[PDB]
Symmetry: D2
Subunit: 155 residues, 4 copies
């Protein structure tokens, strides 16, 4: 119910035109997206977490310095695909919500790609298995992720 309802909310975000009101490339913009997707579903919708979380051997940015990290991440440049991917990779490492980081930050990435490069990711053609592998590796080396995503951009 939660994930189907948030998918409907994501659809609403685009169909409504409310997507055009989201700040691009900023922490606030990511919060806007998360609040939109999960509002009325998670009580923490749009809110930066205060608890620590991990997945698959990686511990995401410690909540005690997550806000400081986000301030630095949102200032990263967006001039090229490689810069945009690097910025996305650091926002994923920040992982600022208890849940729904993936969906919200992928929308956030698409807005950055669209603003700067006039392209978005064609997610329907991206393997979820290969995407997860590439994201898991990305804090160490974003090569796999860049190869995967660059092949799946659409203008």
């Amino acid at each position: 119910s939660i994930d189907e309802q948030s998918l409907h909310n994501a659809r609403r975000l685009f169909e409504s035109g409310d997507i055009d009101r989201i700040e691009v490339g900023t922490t606030a913009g990511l919060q806007q997206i998360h609040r939109y997707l999960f509002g009325g579903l998670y009580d923490f919708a749009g809110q930066i977490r205060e608890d620590n979380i991990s997945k698959g051997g990686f511990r995401f940015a410690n909540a005690m310095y997550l806000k400081e990290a986000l301030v630095k991440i949102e200032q990263m440049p967006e001039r090229t695909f490689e810069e945009i991917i690097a910025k996305y990779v650091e926002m994923n490492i920040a992982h600022p919500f208890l849940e729904g980081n993936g969906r919200s930050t992928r929308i956030w990435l698409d807005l950055v790609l669209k603003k700067n490069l006039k392209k978005v990711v064609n997610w329907q053609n991206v393997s979820k298995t290969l995407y997860l592998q590439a994201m898991e590796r990305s804090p160490v080396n974003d090569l796999e992720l860049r190869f995967l995503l660059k092949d799946n951009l659409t203008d």
Copy 2:
């Protein structure tokens, strides 16, 4: 060459009593230890890194917010073995030097244990292989590290 002299430098730190002048439980204190062990050996002795580093697939705190991270980590409480281990785990994730984090931060840990618990680690009885495993796991769960060290304390 470097490791041999730095081991001599660590013995001098203790045997001279210079160890008693090290600030306990702080970033500055860790820098003091690192400067003492590696002064004249690494030109970055005592200095917070500006480059990014990883080991075993784990990305240590990004250099862009590392200084900010350290300000927070050093304020962590030190009242119990579990608190002190948690603080140590976070200082390891920070990994604030290019090299020599292990040796420096273990001395740092012992000073915190000594101050607050009147105990230090009996490293003589700790397997390096098992210690490395526990440290690698610690960001996700410090159970292995607590299991390894707690009954290896000595007063």
Copy 3:
């Protein structure tokens, strides 16, 4: 869809009494469980994989020597809780199917615990988050898994 239907099959395995005919602690027994759960749902139901697979940075036993590995794994002893967990850990590393290893092998584990200790895991009280973490760690050290499961055995 597949998950809801396989769950129904797993309930039927127990409710029908068919569970009592499953060979305990063997590769063939694991295959019997997988075929029952996934027959008609995955065309590879019950079948040892010929493709390589990975999760979270760990590559499961190479398909080229998987059958050989399974021959050794099923011979492992089941004399104590700790031996049984060790055997379960090796069967998870083998990871013999393309999908459904988790559900099938947890049933397989319970049959081994029941046969040798007259216990099963009370999975209802086991955190999925902590279980996944413990499984991810288990190839290196099964301490987390033993801590988790021993606290959740039932008669």
Copy 4:
């Protein structure tokens, strides 16, 4: 002491021309290299391990089926760079010795590349940091390793 003495033996393996007498692409050939490097230094020189080992959170092939694994791995083809790297990656996962797998298996790799492609790796121009990263990743995805090594091939 052992690392320096083994380097000298490695030096001699090439200086003497004995490298030309080593069996190429086989388990026996790898054991020959390991014995040349470490015979008289490690008591287990040239011997397939009977103990389990791991590094960086990765469990190498279980000793109970390591021999069976090696029988399969040595049969892997060697016709393309990609096949040769895949074979090397599997021999590293097998990790057949207690110690000295890296040095011995890199020599083994060069012999297979030399035989089949008339090239070897120019290890002088390969970053040890990037190499270890690429090795750690290789069981999941050998792209990093292939990217790192292919443009460092020489004759």
